[PDB]
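Q: What changes when calcium ion is included in the input?
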Amino acid sequence: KNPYPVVNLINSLFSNLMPKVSGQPMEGKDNQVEEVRIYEGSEQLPGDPDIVR
Amino acid sequence: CIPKPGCCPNVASVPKLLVKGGVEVLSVVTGEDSITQIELYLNPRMGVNSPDLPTTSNWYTYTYDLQPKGSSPDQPIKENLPAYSVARVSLPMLNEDITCDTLQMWEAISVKTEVVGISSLINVHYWDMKRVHDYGAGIPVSGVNYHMFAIGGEPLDLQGLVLDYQTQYPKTTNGGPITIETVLGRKMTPKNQGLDPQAKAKLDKDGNYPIEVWCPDPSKNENSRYYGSIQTGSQTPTVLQFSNTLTTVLLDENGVGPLCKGDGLFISCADIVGFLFKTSGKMALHGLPRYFNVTLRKRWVKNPYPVVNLINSLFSNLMPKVSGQPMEGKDNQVEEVRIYEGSEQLPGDPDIVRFLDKF
Amino acid sequence: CIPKPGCCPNVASVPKLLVKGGVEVLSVVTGEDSIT
Amino acid sequence: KNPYPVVNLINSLFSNLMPKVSGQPMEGKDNQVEEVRIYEGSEQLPGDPDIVR
Amino acid sequence: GVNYHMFAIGGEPLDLQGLVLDYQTQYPKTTNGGPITIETVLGRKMTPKNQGL
Ligand SMILES: [Ca+2]
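A: The predicted holo structure follows.
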């Protein structure tokens, strides 16, 4: 059974083939990213709006 | 409504065109039943291969003065080596059906061709033409002819053969033309005066594969169709005909034309018209371009190659390669290979010999 | 048409051999149950 | 089972029914056969006449 | 005298491990041909760790 599904290889291939992009660091030790939130569905309003999950 | 088919007169039905223009319109997406049609030309690359250079473009579509050296060996000038012409036409992508494992490829079904500029040959008044006799007119362009063209979906495969292997063709420099010892890597042997299966090379570039050295390899030109002609004489007359009614069909005995791999149409041609007898006695060849009216259509084919195995070849860890002992080719270190499938009644001799003359 | 089973003797069922040769042979297309 | 055809055997023994010729080589190291193709049956059209394996 | 016999069958190139009887030895350098030694793989002179695993 193909262990590596083709779709993941396709993107993983052209990305290396496509011209690279040397921007400001956005991943790794010196990432320039502060918060990243992810929502899904609706819940009753929690008290603390600064909640972290 | 108001068509009135009985009252309205009858008008014949013909295929309608959706667009007409340059290459730019080739990017128009079409249906499956669409039929494109390309009209293009190819100027003759015959040693003097560009009018743009200012120094010596006065001899475009010509060669320098040909003459025998007179002392072994021969060191010919690049501008005395007529070469084949070639071009690739990038065709747009097509649909595919992975579930059914089929896809579309461009098929060339018919080609209309013609040699442009034939009428230009009646010019007997050139200020340096050798008179046929005193107080007379010049000697019209005549002599050797080499006509050839090819239509295919992959570059034309070639075979090399020369008239003398002693000949020292120009070196492998990038601007220089490709010769026999270029592809081999060694000075060519007298075997090359005859057929040599080692002297093969595809027609990659333009104006770099000389005619007097290369000829279409009939064995592997199987996904393309080529036609040729020749006449060899000192002052042999040149006979050519042309019209727009002559159409050439490219289909094979199975009913398919050349399939454009990589969505690319490959066209090759070469037409030597004759010599140009100069007053000084010197001689030089001349050529003319060709017209090409290719009719293309869409055909469905089965993808013969497994996708996953094919794409994995690009990954290093999935396709490992080594510099092992010779296990393929002239020095293969394999003695026998047997394939077993299904069962049969027991044969007597286990070492079955199929050829009759062997034992 | 078929030969008389009683009039004709039976033999063993050895695996069928399709081809025997050099390296140029591996190109042969074979079924899903073939052995090399 | 007899693997070898009886008639073809005795045909080898006669110079008339098995003529030989000392011609250019068509076998061995210096053979002069560029390619051989063997067709049997029928399939759907492949997308490449220059099939590689 | 001395005998050493091994064979390996696999769908991948055989994975090897480096171990030398003496790291003091200086094997010939790899110059477009010639043996490949631990020095060639690591890029450093062999440390006495290499006498072990
Ligand atoms: Ca062939």
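Observations recorded in class: The two ends of chain B are 86 Å apart (CA to CA).
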